[PDB]
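PT: before anyone asks, these are the final sequences, not the draft ones from last week. 124 residues across everything. Please model them as a single complex and drop the result in this thread when it's through.
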Amino acid sequence: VTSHIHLHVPEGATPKDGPSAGCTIVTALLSLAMGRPVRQNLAMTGEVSLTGKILPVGGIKE
Amino acid sequence: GGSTLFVETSLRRPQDKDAKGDKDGSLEVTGQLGEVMKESARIAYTFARAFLMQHAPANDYL
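LR: through. Structure below.
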């Protein structure tokens, strides 16, 4: 709520699938807020909808 | 070939604008840099701020 934050998402995502980083960004922010490092060897992808609902994404195989 | 460049820094405005002043430390960059360079410089800036914080909390220079 009350902290200036800098978040960096590395370049490389194609423009269409870029929003797929929504859940990643959210979990990164929560980890920073609580300082609890995310579980190891974990990855996530998907879109967020301002409410918690998550949407499909493309390029699943890659 | 490879060369060595002396990266230089300076404090281009008075430190104590206000003892109570909360204005965030601005940044200005020279070197006719590209956009990726600007983002890299910003990232380095933020990390240096955070490291000073984690090491020298009293020093608010940055």
